[PDB]
Design a binder for these strands. Structure first.
Lengths: 98, 96, 127, 150, 206, 105
RNA sequence: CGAAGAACCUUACCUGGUCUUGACAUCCACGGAAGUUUUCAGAGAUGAGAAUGUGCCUUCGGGAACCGUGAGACAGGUGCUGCAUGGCUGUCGUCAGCUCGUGUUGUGAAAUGUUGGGUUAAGUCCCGCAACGAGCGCAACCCUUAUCCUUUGUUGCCAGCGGUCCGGCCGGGAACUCAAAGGAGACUGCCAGUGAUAAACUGGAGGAAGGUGGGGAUGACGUCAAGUCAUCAUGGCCCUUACGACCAGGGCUACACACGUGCUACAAUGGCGCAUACAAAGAGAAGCGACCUCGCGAGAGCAAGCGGACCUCAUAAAGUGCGUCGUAGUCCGGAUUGGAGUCUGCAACUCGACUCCAUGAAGUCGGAAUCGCUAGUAAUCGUGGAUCAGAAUGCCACGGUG
RNA sequence: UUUUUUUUUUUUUUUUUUUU
């Protein structure tokens, strides 16, 4: 139960990233988990871009900031290794640390 | 008291280990109530100005100390920009 | 084979199963009268099963995660409403005709700024 | 105010199937706590029954007959001055009002515990002696009489 | 009785940014700081044909500077010697390189700004610019638009005089986050005090 | 003339079917108006009301079937007759409607 | 009150000790390697000594980190006016808004669709009336529900069995809570009564809400010539031997007076003594800390752990079973005063904040007359948080016997 | 076209220049 806490700004990017592990870190060992979410930060966003001090111009946006547990039952090198070889996919913050 | 004692803290703040909290790791053990050597503490207490834990602090994003919100790292007057750049992530429509 | 239900009232956080026959009502490891022994609300948790002759035909097993007996006494109501809804379609009428089908959702347009009721609009006989 | 949404429906009592006994103790509460107060009022119907050794619940109505009113007087100035004008309380308000008069006597009424106040006060009611009968009868000596001045 | 930005509140909807760049957690402060300074320098270089849009992109903190002016040929120089200069003095503050890209203001008459830079130039002649103010709006309106409202506040008379004047050469749907509208400004002096002109250019409906 | 009037929401489109109900019944004989009228042919003076006032302000020709309550000095053409009902107008109109096309030549 | 800590405190002010380029920060002129450690003075600012140190490019040039003294330019403060103005917030406001691009009866302050018939709780809807329609309010996007639908199985979490050394313990699998992303389904839908088979209003098929289903929310013009004038953003105008900036002290609380806000004490629908059944709302490395050692305890120590259901702070109070008082100023009243101790601190004492034992000031149901509070809502029944080297009873928000 | 539920409540000073 080593918890690789995958996250991104968008749902689209974390989807592609977990879908590689649940198959490839599963190859000869664990039933590796990956869809299982956390308190996903669906809030509202406000930054000022008013060209002078006059009415509003604080253009309100929306976010996903979506997060999941990848879970590996044993460190078993002969099954996990593809997730450590996945280093090149920089845009997903993986928080392996436990 | 505006820019003030900054000039006095900056010259001794970074050495609070050397003044106490690593200089203590042999002689300060005996010197405690739990250990009773009565002779000792009273001759480590002399540095007075550095004497930790004491730091007047540096609110930086405000040029002077109109207070300082330790939960948030900003002055007591400063809140309203965080609705206009997100530095307080629960700053939304008020609970009253 | 078997049936099920779950509820959310005051604040339980409890479930129920149904098993084929012999007519009892347990709570994990003790009987109903042990878990609710003086709580005046103890009577309702079996009452729409006893109707349809449970004694040799149905049997009941409750489990819990927020004990809360003054809410649990009705959380079990909507729960056992669910269990029955797949055993017998006919009792949708019964459960409805006696209220057992309902769950907790209604305030009556209440206080937000200070006026007691706040949806009903300004009103006349010509103005 | 145009909607028919008004009053409180509740369930009946846990032993004998009446909204009467439920509402009765559901005034007597004075601080909430319902369940044990319903158990004390059960003991009140038993401590009533110790007067005969039969079904004295058959006498709970017989007593409350002397304590249900007809009249109530409300805030009325419609002829330039105080002008009452009772008008009747509806069929359902009849014994719900009597609880208030039983409770407002019971609160301080001096008997041997919480049940034995309501047992004795409903004994007195049965015999027309009741504090609740006297509280009723005073608004009958007052309001029901001003029916000839309205 | 309100001044109301149509711009800024709606960046993705026909009104593109003054800056679109990305700094994380710690790295925001010196970016923003420089975002006033390179802007300062650029406009005093450009003022010989102004700057309609002053577009600071930052592809890797280093700065893809994108400058709409009426006459590129004077900031290009005699071909390339001011493009060297600018790229030096806009990188210098930032500490990182700044790729100076031009654009041409496609006819100044139609623009998000240059209607205000025409009227505020006239206050440097010091004589009665009113002879030329409604005129220079109505000229630019024969070459583009469907409505415009224009406001001047300032010191526009003599000795102690400060007052404010308002004008309407067409209708103005005031905020509409679907329309082609632009709000903007420009600022003058006349040896007594400020003359600050503002515009609402109702160009088109959608 | 096609089917695209039925778009978006049916209530957003029935809002305009009510606009049809209130406008084609009130303007259905003048749906174009790319230039002004040149002459006014008319059968009332007090309900129709405005028509004779607008005409006289602009100096327009007017052809008007009228009775004993009239003011004949506000029309180019009085035609003396019973003011109302379908019998009276129908005596005059089958010549009017012919002439306004057969006279084109 | 601002003050969410008027006894280092963001300093009023009472002062005394320095100054008026001052604490902070530049452009040239000649020059410097930057700092660690005590000793004696001093209330702080600052004063007098003694030792120990010598960095990176390296054109040996120019300087960096980084410290100087000497030039000319040259530094600052909540000072309120709403009234140059823009954001912003309010109680009025969930009224279905006004006034206008044209027109024209009114010269103009009259609104000019509110008029004339009727019709609805409703500017409700049939029309009419010399009235258009132009778009910013409209039409509504929302958040949380709540019930579920797929993909799910999460420290979660346990249907049905696998071992039990009796702990979901560890095997073992996918019913559902949970966690939750994409999202989704309730409409006069069909039944009776209502009347004009309009209206809509009632009960109900059917339901997790019902006729905005609830709770948050946005809060248009019009908003008192009201604010935020103590971060606002800035036009008109401040004092500048000054409202500019360094630093140690202290004293705000008295006491006759009230008067209230906030606290309670007047005993059994109470508690008191032993024993028994169930929730959680929260905040959490300037962190929060169990088990476990020494305990009369405030309070010491050991330290697993725990970063977001794992660590911990609640073992809500009610209630329930068995005993004890016997209506009794006590057994309850902490008003408080005999002594005893503490967590920090330059600091609390004429200034607190809490603890251990002795105790015991008003106490027994107060009148007049300042508004709480209609519903899942005030009696009733708790727990948390920040300011900040920190003790608010202020307030602030959701749960639940009722 | 009977219309007494108490009689009274100090001066100021608001008031964003101006020809059009």
């Amino acid at each position: 139960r080593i918890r690789i806490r995958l996250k991104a700004f968008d749902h689209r990017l974390i989807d592609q990233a977990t879908a590689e592990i649940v198959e490839t870190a599963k190859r000869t060992g664990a039933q590796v988990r990956g869809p299982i979410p956390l308190p996903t930060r669906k809030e509202r966003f406000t930054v000022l871009i008013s060209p002078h001090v006059n009415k509003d111009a604080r253009d309100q946006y929306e976010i996903r900031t979506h997060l999941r547990l990848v879970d590996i039952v044993e460190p078993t090198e002969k099954t996990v290794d593809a997730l450590m070889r996945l280093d090149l996919a920089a845009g997903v913050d993986v928080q392996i640390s436990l | 008291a505006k820019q003030s004692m900054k000039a006095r803290e900056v010259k001794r703040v970074a050495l609070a280990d050397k003044y106490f909290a690593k200089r203590a790791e042999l002689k300060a053990i005996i010197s405690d109530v739990n250990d009773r050597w009565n002779a000792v503490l009273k001759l480590q207490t002399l540095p007075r100005d550095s004497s930790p834990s004491r730091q007047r602090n540096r609110c930086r994003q405000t040029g002077r100390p109109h207070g300082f919100l330790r939960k948030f790292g900003l002055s007591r007057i400063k809140v309203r920009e965080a609705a206009m750049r997100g530095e307080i992530p629960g700053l939304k429509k008020a609970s009253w | 084979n078997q049936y099920y239900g779950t509820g959310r009232r005051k604040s339980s956080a409890a479930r129920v199963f149904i098993k084929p026959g012999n007519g009892k009502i347990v709570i994990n490891q003790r009987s109903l009268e042990q878990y609710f022994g003086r709580e005046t609300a103890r009577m309702v948790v079996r009452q729409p099963l006893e109707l349809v002759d449970m004694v040799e035909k149905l049997d009941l097993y409750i489990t819990v995660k927020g004990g809360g007996i003054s809410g649990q006494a009705g959380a079990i109501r909507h729960g056992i409403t669910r269990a029955l809804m797949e055993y017998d379609e006919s009792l949708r009428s019964e459960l409805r005709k006696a209220g057992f089908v309902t769950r907790d959702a209604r305030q009556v347009e209440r206080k937000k700024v200070g006026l007691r009721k706040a949806r009903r609009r300004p009103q006349f006989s010509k103005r | 105010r145009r909607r028919v949404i008004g009053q409180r429906k509740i369930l009946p009592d846990p032993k004998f199937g009446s909204e009467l006994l439920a509402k009765f103790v559901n005034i007597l509460m004075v601080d909430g706590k319902k369940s044990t107060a319903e158990s004390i009022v059960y003991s009140a119907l038993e401590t009533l029954a110790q007067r005969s050794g039969k079904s004295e619940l058959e006498a709970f109505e017989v007593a409350l007959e002397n304590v249900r009113p007809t009249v109530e007087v409300k805030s009325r100035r419609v002829g330039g001055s105080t002008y009452q004008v009772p008008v009747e309380v509806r069929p359902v308000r009849r014994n719900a009002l009597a609880m208030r008069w039983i409770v407002e006597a019971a609160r301080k009424r001096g008997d041997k515990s919480m049940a034995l106040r309501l047992a004795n006060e409903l004994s007195d009611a049965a015999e027309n002696k009741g504090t609740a009968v006297k509280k009723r009868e005073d608004v009958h000596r007052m309001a029901e009489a001003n029916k000839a001045f309205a | 009785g309100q001044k109301v930005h149509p711009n800024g509140i709606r960046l993705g909807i026909v009104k593109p940014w003054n800056s679109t760049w990305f700094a994380n957690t710690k790295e925001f402060a010196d970016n923003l700081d420089s975002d006033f300074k390179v802007r300062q320098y650029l406009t005093k270089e450009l003022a010989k044909a102004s700057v309609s849009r002053i577009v600071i992109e930052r592809p890797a903190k280093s700065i893809r500077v994108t400058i709409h002016t009426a006459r590129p040929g004077i900031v290009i120089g005699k071909k390339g010697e001011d493009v060297e200069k600018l790229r030096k003095v806009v990188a210098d503050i930032a500490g990182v390189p700044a790729q100076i890209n031009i654009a041409e203001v496609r006819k100044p008459e139609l623009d998000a700004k240059l209607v205000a830079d025409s009227i505020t130039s006239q206050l440097e002649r010091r004589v009665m610019f009113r002879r030329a103010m409604k005129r220079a709006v109505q000229n630019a309106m024969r070459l583009g638009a469907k409505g415009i409202k224009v406001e001047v506040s300032g010191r526009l008379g003599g000795a102690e005089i400060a007052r404010t004047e308002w004008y309407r050469e067409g209708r103005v749907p005031l905020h509409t986050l679907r329309a082609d509208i632009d709000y903007n400004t420009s600022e003058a002096h006349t040896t007594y005090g400020v003359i600050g002109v503002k515009v609402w250019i109702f160009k088109g409906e959608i | 003339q096609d089917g695209t009037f039925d778009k978006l929401t049916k209530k957003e489109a029935l809002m305009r079917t009510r606009e049809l109900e209130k406008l084609e019944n009130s303007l259905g004989g003048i749906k174009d108006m790319g230039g002004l009228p040149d002459a006014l042919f008319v059968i009332d003076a007090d309900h129709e009301h405005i028509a004779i006032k607008e005409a006289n302000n602009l100096g327009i020709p007017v052809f008007a079937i009228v009775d004993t309550n009239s003011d004949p000095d506000g029309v180019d053409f009085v035609i003396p007759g019973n003011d109302d009902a379908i019998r009276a107008v129908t005596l005059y109109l089958g010549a009017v409607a012919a002439t306004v096309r057969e006279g084109r030549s």
